[PDB]
Amino acid sequence: TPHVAIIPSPGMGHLIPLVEFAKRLVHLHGLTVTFVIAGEGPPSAQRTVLDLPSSISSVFLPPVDLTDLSSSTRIESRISLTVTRSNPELRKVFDSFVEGGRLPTALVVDLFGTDAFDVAVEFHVPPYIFYPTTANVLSFFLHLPKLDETVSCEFRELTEPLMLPGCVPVAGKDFLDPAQDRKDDAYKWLLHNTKRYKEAEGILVNTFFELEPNAIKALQEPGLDKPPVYPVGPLVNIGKQEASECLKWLDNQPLGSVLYVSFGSGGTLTCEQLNELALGLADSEQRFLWVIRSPSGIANSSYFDSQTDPLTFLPPGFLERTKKRGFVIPFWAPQAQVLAHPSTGGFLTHCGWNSTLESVVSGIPLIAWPLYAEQKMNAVLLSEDIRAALRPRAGDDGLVRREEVARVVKGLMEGEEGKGVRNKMKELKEAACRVLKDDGTSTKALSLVALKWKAHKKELEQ
Ligand SMILES: O=c1ccn([C@@H]2O[C@H](COP(=O)(O)OP(=O)(O)O)[C@@H](O)[C@H]2O)c(=O)[nH]1
């Protein structure tokens, strides 16, 4: 059977969907999978995630040396270089696969891991990309080499939004974070990765037709140097695994009553914003379950990570006033289970794509609160095109004040404002089931890829 090697770039939001993808490959397609894990140190959260059928093994590479990098290095530079600098160790793993008679049939990287294609090419292994965010942002990535060549200003200076075929228009000032400073190595690494996308034999994207129909149709049209694109989503943890205290609390709340609040694996708010969010959550008088992290002036400061107790940053009396109706859990919650719980009724999200897809699969409507990466692009898609998220108004200083927090929370949970988004999520919840049935469009697309891999292995071995 074909052996698929998967090399994630750092980040829980890369590993989680890749593990769901691997599980479908082994269970539904009979393939074998090895994760090759690059990094800086032992896995965190990560181990809970990698802890799987026998058909899935994990190899942890020796940690890469990133000690030459400035403390102010942006995350995408760190993420990309973790994979690039791991190539010599990845080659050693591939030599071990050759010796064991299990040369991979495919090497799957994620959106920042394209330098591992060097190893794939050396070993005559087809390179693929598993793209863990939207077809809209994939379109942006595929177009970036051309955009870079044709546009010479910082993107925030663009007066017209970018309107790629089938895509929601996005202002230059809202392009993903690593695109916002073209002089920084984060842009250099983003651009470099995008220029390698044309080398992929296929790109599997964690989205589905009904969610992004116009962008998927455009991506699948033949184009210059464009690989085949396969929507295979939503590949998520559906939340049926046994976790505890926050779920026990949830069990005691009415159907559809609780607002879950979470800023992904890496997100933090500023002090001032943390304060206004807490105050506005209390003011709203809604039930809530908030995964809290200590504040920072850097929005993705927890990406790789807490020492301090986040509860110490809450305002006077907040924990007291919300002792019954709010549950505040530091650092990490069993998010899949929360979103699948019948007592959950809404989600204030940073618009990371895994969180969005988990919410879609359970029909939970959103308040879009983007922080870093491509989240603002996702917020525009969710609120202006898909229409499954409400957005809070930030003042000219960037702060969402407590009055606005309370307004949008009540709008989502009880208001006329939230009816449209709740209905759209109901329809998307159905569609998410449709596309994953045996002859649903996402199952068909993944099956085409697995069939290609089975054919390739058959030809090689005969
Ligand atoms: O407290 C938390 C926060 C995050 N997650 C999971 O971590 C992933 C976060 O990925 P996402 O794409 O939403 O954002 P990122 O962390 O990459 O910014 C999702 O699968 C979440 O369910 C979780 O289980 N508990």
Swiss-Prot record:
The enzyme's E.C. designation: 2.4.1.-, 2.4.1.218
Alphabetical keyword list: Detoxification, Glycosyltransferase, Transferase
Deletion phenotype: No visible phenotype under normal growth condition.
Matching Pfam families: UDPGT
Residues the entry annotates as binding UDP-alpha-D-glucose: S265, W332, A333, H350, W353, N354, S355, E358, Y372, E374, Q375
Keyword Glycosyltransferase: yes
Residues the record marks as active site: H14 (proton acceptor), D110 (charge relay)
UniProt-listed InterPro entries: UDP_glucos_trans, UDP_glycos_trans_CS
Entry annotated with the keyword Transferase: yes
Catalytic activity of the protein: hydroquinone + UDP-alpha-D-glucose = hydroquinone O-beta-D-glucopyranoside + UDP + H(+)
Domain of life: Eukaryota
Consequence the record notes for mutating D110A: Loss of activity
Record-listed UDP binding positions: S265, W332, A333, H350, N354, S355, E358, Y372
Effect of Y303F: Decreases activity. Loss of N-glycosyltransferase activity
UniProt cross-references to Gene3D superfamilies, sorted A to Z: Glycogen Phosphorylase B (3.40.50.2000)
GO biological process, one term: xenobiotic metabolic process
Coiled-coil segments: none
An MF annotation (GO) of this entry: UDP-glycosyltransferase activity
CDD domains: GT1_Gtf-like
PANTHER family attached to this UniProt entry: GLYCOSYLTRANSFERASE (PTHR48046:SF6), UDP-GLYCOSYLTRANSFERASE 72E1 (PTHR48046)
Similarity annotation: Belongs to the UDP-glycosyltransferase family.
Function: Bifunctional O-glycosyltransferase and N-glycosyltransferase that can detoxify xenobiotics. Possesses high activity to metabolize the persistent pollutants 2,4,5-trichlorophenol (TCP) and 3,4-dichloroaniline (DCA). Also active on benzoates and benzoate derivatives in vitro.
Record-given protein name: UDP-glycosyltransferase 72B1
Originating organism: Arabidopsis thaliana (Mouse-ear cress)
Gene: UGT72B1
